[PDB]
Design a binder for this molecule. Structure first.
Ligand SMILES: O=C(O)/C(S)=C/c1c(Cl)ccc(Cl)c1Cl
Ligand SMILES: [Zn+2]
Ligand SMILES: [Zn+2]
Length: 218
């Protein structure tokens, strides 16, 4: 059984392996997932949380547990569950990575701006931790990216990828339902061997979540 650690219970982290954890927060009631990467040069998060209060608590929880600082965050699209803590990141000197499009949309919607440094494919390295970011096309939003850990074949699907418990596509106001399938296929083509898939919301699964999402798009 995987190690799970809670704060009230509104914040929980679950261990996938030695240096990779999933962080899950309760907002709005809607759970949301990101990733915590424990590296030799600091903690790196995939995505922040619903607001600054949760993001502050999240950072402080992991900094205390792993006894190092959060240095970087990768923001995977410009909705609040992803970017709501951007103010906290900026003021603490935490680098908030994103595509230029994610940054533009963030600004348009009144959030503070992440860096806009991520290209269609960007390869980062934090200590020994390798991280690839990939823009597969439009889906849940026009800007959604996925994150790949090549040393573990772990894919962070974000809100592009629906969990098994999701029986519909959810809010599609900002979505592109005619391109979303092609974008999933682009992910499946790039990462042909996947061990775990972390959805934006819900339980961790595998490649099956990508197939589940394709079915929901029919
Ligand atoms: O279904 C999802 O994954 C997301 S992020 C839903 C959503 C939207 Cl579409 C707008 C705004 C907000 Cl706050 C949320 Cl949570
Ligand atoms: Zn979203
Ligand atoms: Zn979401």
């Amino acid at each position: 059984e995987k190690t799970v650690i809670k704060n009230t219970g509104t914040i929980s982290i679950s261990q996938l392996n030695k240096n990779v954890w999933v962080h899950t927060e309760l907002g709005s009631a809607v759970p949301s997932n990101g990733l915590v990467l424990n590296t030799s040069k600091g903690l790196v998060l995939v995505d922040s949380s619903w607001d600054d209060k949760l993001t502050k608590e999240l950072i402080e929880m992991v900094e205390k547990k792993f006894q190092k600082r959060v240095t970087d965050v990768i923001i995977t699209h410009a909705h609040a569950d992803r970017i709501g803590g951007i103010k906290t990141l900026k003021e603490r000197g935490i680098k908030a990575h994103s595509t230029a499009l994610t940054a533009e949309l963030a600004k348009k919607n009144g959030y503070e701006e992440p860096l806009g440094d991520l290209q269609t494919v960007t390869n980062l390295k934090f200590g020994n931790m390798k991280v690839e970011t990939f823009y597969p096309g439009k889906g849940h939003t026009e800007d959604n990216i996925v994150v790949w850990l090549p040393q573990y074949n772990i894919l962070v699907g974000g809100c592009l990828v629906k969990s098994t418990s999701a029986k519909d596509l959810g809010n599609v106001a900002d979505a592109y339902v005619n391109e979303w399938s092609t974008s999933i296929e682009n992910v499946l083509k790039r990462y042909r061997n996947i061990n775990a898939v972390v959805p934006g919301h819900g339980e961790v699964g595998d490649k099956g979540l990508l197939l589940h999402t394709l079915d929901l798009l029919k």
